[PDB]
Amino acid sequence: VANTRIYAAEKLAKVKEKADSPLYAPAVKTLLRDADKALKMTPPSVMDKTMTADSGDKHDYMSMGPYWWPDPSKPDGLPYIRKDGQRNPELDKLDRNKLGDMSKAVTTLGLAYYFSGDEKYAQKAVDFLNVWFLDAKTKMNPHLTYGQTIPGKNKGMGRGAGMIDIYSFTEMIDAMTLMENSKAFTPKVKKGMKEWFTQLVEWMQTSPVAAEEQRAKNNHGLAYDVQLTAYALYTGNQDLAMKTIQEFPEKRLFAQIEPDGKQPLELARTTALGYTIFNLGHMLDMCSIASTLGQDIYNATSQDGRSITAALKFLIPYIGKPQSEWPYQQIKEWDKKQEEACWILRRASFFDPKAGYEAIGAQFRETPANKRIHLIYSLE
Ligand code: NA
Numbered sequence: 001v002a003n004t005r006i007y008a009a010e011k012l013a014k015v016k017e018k019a020d021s022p023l024y025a026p027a028v029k030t031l032l033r034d035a036d037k038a039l040k041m042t043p044p045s046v047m048d049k050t051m052t053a054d055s056g057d058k059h060d061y062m063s064m065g066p067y068w069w070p071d072p073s074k075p076d077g078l079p080y081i082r083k084d085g086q087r088n089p090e091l092d093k094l095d096r097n098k099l100g101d102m103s104k105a106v107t108t109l110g111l112a113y114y115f116s117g118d119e120k121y122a123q124k125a126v127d128f129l130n131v132w133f134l135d136a137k138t139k140m141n142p143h144l145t146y147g148q149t150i151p152g153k154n155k156g157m158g159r160g161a162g163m164i165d166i167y168s169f170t171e172m173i174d175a176m177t178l179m180e181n182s183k184a185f186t187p188k189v190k191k192g193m194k195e196w197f198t199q200l201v202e203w204m205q206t207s208p209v210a211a212e213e214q215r216a217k218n219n220h221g222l223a224y225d226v227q228l229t230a231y232a233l234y235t236g237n238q239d240l241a242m243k244t245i246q247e248f249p250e251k252r253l254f255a256q257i258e259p260d261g262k263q264p265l266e267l268a269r270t271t272a273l274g275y276t277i278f279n280l281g282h283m284l285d286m287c288s289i290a291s292t293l294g295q296d297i298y299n300a301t302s303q304d305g306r307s308i309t310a311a312l313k314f315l316i317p318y319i320g321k322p323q324s325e326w327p328y329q330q331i332k333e334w335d336k337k338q339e340e341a342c343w344i345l346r347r348a349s350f351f352d353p354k355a356g357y358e359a360i361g362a363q364f365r366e367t368p369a370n371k372r373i374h375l376i377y378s379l380e
Pocket of ligand 1: 179180181182183184185186187
């Protein structure tokens with residue numbers, strides 16, 4: 001059983017034993033196909049962008065606030081203006097999509113190595129990690145001072161919101177763990193990766209840009225805690241992880257969930273169903289991490305009934321009901337988010353099996369048998 005924090009380690013180990021069973025074989029085959037596609041990809045880096053942040057160092061990560069667009073009423077489009085839920089394709093010019101491609105590839109490859117034992121996949125993953133994190137010529141500095149810059153705003157600086165850009169590192173770390181016994185993922189590679197994340201954690205605890213994210217009242221602030229906890233554990237700082245976990249119900253859950261389960265700061269968005277689910281999934285990621293340390297975040301309940309269960313119970317009636325009945329905005333991705341909701345229910349069922357959540361999810365889910373999520377959130 002591997003030391004995973006986001007992924008349920010014992011379940012995953014059983015799915016691996018049963019990789020060739022009829023239940024898992026289609027998904028394993030698709031996973032190895034995805035890994036074969038990743039073998040073809042040239043590892044990107046923060047050096048690929050044409051622009052450089054206002055530090056003048058190309059090795060600094062730079063991205064753009066995704067919902068910020070040129071203002072047609074202004075001569076040069078500046079300053080940009082916000083269109084909540086509408087992603088400006090200009091963001092592709094900077095580092096965000098390269099980081100995404102890298103993180104997804106390493107995750108795919110590490111999972112492929114875990115399930116198959118084929119060393120080629122771990123060797124490619126280590127190539128991505130060298131290029132992105134460790135090689136002097138191409139590496140990303142371990143900070144997000146210039147995360148989610150916005151043209152014409154914030155005096156060229158990034159902002160706390162940029163922290164969300166790296167949220168997938170929570171999962172990537174589990175994929176690295178899963179590859180540690182590969183030949184390619186050496187003690188030197190491991191040390192380099194732990195040193196990078198140690199520096200990132202130092203920056204997260206000191207920087208004023210990171211502090212902006214820590215103070216955030218919505219999904220950003222909840223996600224900050226999850227990332228801090230996961231990176232603390234990866235770097236051996238169990239005490240910081242424990243502290244962040246113990247403070248999480250009062251700081252995040254009871255602040256952001258109303259007694260009827262509503263998450264008002266998410267429901268006010270143009271993608272209110274999407275953000276309700278985004279935050280619930282991050283809550284469940286914290287529950288998963290916390291469970292590995294014997295901390296029961298899932299059942300944490302305030303005196304007035306705020307809890308993850310309340311938040312789930314708000315959502316459930318809308319699953320399988322048409323958009324007409326959802327009294328908030330959801331400007332895109334309705335069917336996609338309905339499907340995601342069904343997998344929220346699978347994940348919740350791990351913590352509260354008697355609630356009948358999987359039966360509800362199974363009633364409305366149309367997820368093909370070969371999708372990776374069947375492997376990661378199995379019923380083992
Ligand atoms: Na190794």
